């Protein structure tokens, strides 16, 4: 009732963790090491399942550090109540593909990764390490009413049909 | 009270549909056939209006299939209580514009569209078909208090001024 | 209790404003003038602090006008209850870097900015002016339960492990 069921699907999974006791979200960790080149897309596995109860939705979203410092973009996942599969981090390296080469991959803090064994990478490539903190899960109540088709609404609003307005 | 008013604005509109009875969102369908080239932006019409009541906001957001499989990016629309206009899907084909040509448009499952009448397209172009399911609407309660300007807050938090932290 | 504490951190700050009395969000204004070139990223300062109470999260998100009309992309910030720092607008000019030059910067309505003193800019560059309305803050209640690790969930759902489905 004030409890959320969490299922760890492999040895690579980490239990989600809340930094401060009043923060919104539970930190989410990668269960896989992946390199993403510029423009490359992936669904990164967490090997974590949850059982969000009816009346709620999970928002599987970015962290402020990773999104602001790198070109790694996470599309917010709407995690349905009842979904018991592996939580997937839906991600793109949105660094441009400019055809330049470099010796340095970048980590999720945008720091150059110095390797003893030197290799050539596409400029703007990132490595995500297993066990790194790349997303968070925030759970929010939802309203799911019956839909009633109408020809006209039962009240006239101040806003009306106005949208996509200027600044 | 557990009812949402929905107004269909044309013959091309489809009534929004919830897949599972505990899912968060109502599937939203395009009322238009559009081709989007790489980097092209549009507001796609649903020809659907709704009357979200005070105390709530609608989140007009992506589906997991379309966002993960294509370069089609939907910016989450915050649908105001009282807004009675046509719901617009705010979208970009974020495929890079690399100047390559192809015979194949892609659908929203990222499958090549085979045509009897062959044409040249920009590589990374998508067609969205009228009646296709490209977004969803999730409704969430909101807190809208009066704002009280202060010189200092009435409590000291654990978090304090910390933000945009590392991993 | 129906009150939100707001702290103005400088003379460049503006008090957040709700357009209609039933709208979801409080408009948020830039405290800085910045030019963003294609692919450039920034955290734009508002010089505004807030004290979101426990049980809520702030969503610092785009406006419909700016996102639909420009290539300026704002990543939704999850503003923690207790965070008392300067609200940062996490932004990218996602206009492609095509190496073309122009005399015209664009404003956030995507209008060309005519200058008496003519200068060369990168095509797709935007200027954000201090005091312009570029984001909004929507506050939403959250559920933050204790996590209970399990080997199997206490109910079988209709959805099950299904996710990232087709259209
Ligand atoms: O970023 C995401 C988005 C969705 N899902 C899963 C959980 C959702 O309940 C399910 C939705 O799938 P469709 O309804 O789009 O098929 O996919 C994820 O794991 N991560
Ligand atoms: O993706 C979106 C975003 C907004 N709107 C509409 C409904 C909102 O209430 C209204 C907000 O317009 P402004 O307040 O930004 O002018 O625009 C949409 O239809 N789709
Ligand atoms: O777009 C954003 C995202 C986050 N934050 C601040 C407020 C949050 O509480 C804090 C989170 O920082 P980390 O927990 O990611 O370190 O950063 C912003 O000001 N703007
Ligand atoms: Mg891009
Ligand atoms: Mg979002």
Author numbering:
A (entry chain A), B (entry chain A), C (entry chain A): 2 to 168
Task: Quote from the publication.
We have recently proposed that the trimeric staphylococcal phage encoded dUTPases (Duts) are signaling molecules that act analogously to eukaryotic G-proteins, using dUTP as a second messenger. To initiate the SaPI cycle, a specific phage-encoded protein binds to the SaPI-encoded repressor Stl, acting as an antirepressor. However, our results analyzing the Dut protein from phage 80α (Dut80α) revealed that motif VI is essential for interaction with the SaPI-encoded Stl repressor, determining the affinity with which the Dut proteins bind to the Stl repressor.
We thought that the differential effect of each nucleotide could be related to the mechanism of Stl binding and we tried to clarify this ambiguity using two complementary strategies: first, we solved the structure of the Dut80α bound to dUMP; next, we analyzed the formation of the Stl:Dut complex in the presence of dUMP. Remarkably, the structure of the Dut80αWT bound to the dUMP showed that motif V was ordered over the active site. Comparison with the structure of Dut80α bound to dUPNPP shows a slight but evident difference in the conformation of motif V, that affects the last four C-terminal residues. The reported fast posthydrolysis release of dUTP products, pyrophosphate and dUMP, in Duts would also be favored by the weaker dUMP stabilization of motif V over the active center as is reflected by the B-factors increment of this region (30% higher for motif V than for Dut main body) and the absence of density for the final two residues on dUMP-bound Dut80α. Interestingly, the dUMP-induced motif V conformation was similar to one of our previously characterized Dut80α mutants, in this case the Dut80α D81A D110C S168C (in short Dut80αD81A C-C). And in agreement with the results obtained by Szabo et al. with Dutϕ11 (13), the dUMP does not interfere with the formation of the Stl:Dut80α complex. In summary, while the crystallographic data show that dUMP induces conformational changes in the C-terminal part of motif V, the affinity of the Dut:Stl complex is not increased in the presence of this nucleotide, suggesting that this change neither favors nor hampers the interaction with the repressor. Indeed, the analyzed motif IV residues are in close vicinity of the pyrophosphate and C- terminal part of motif V, the two elements that show changes (the first is absent and the second alter its conformation), depending on whether it is the dUMP or the dUTP that is bound to the enzyme.
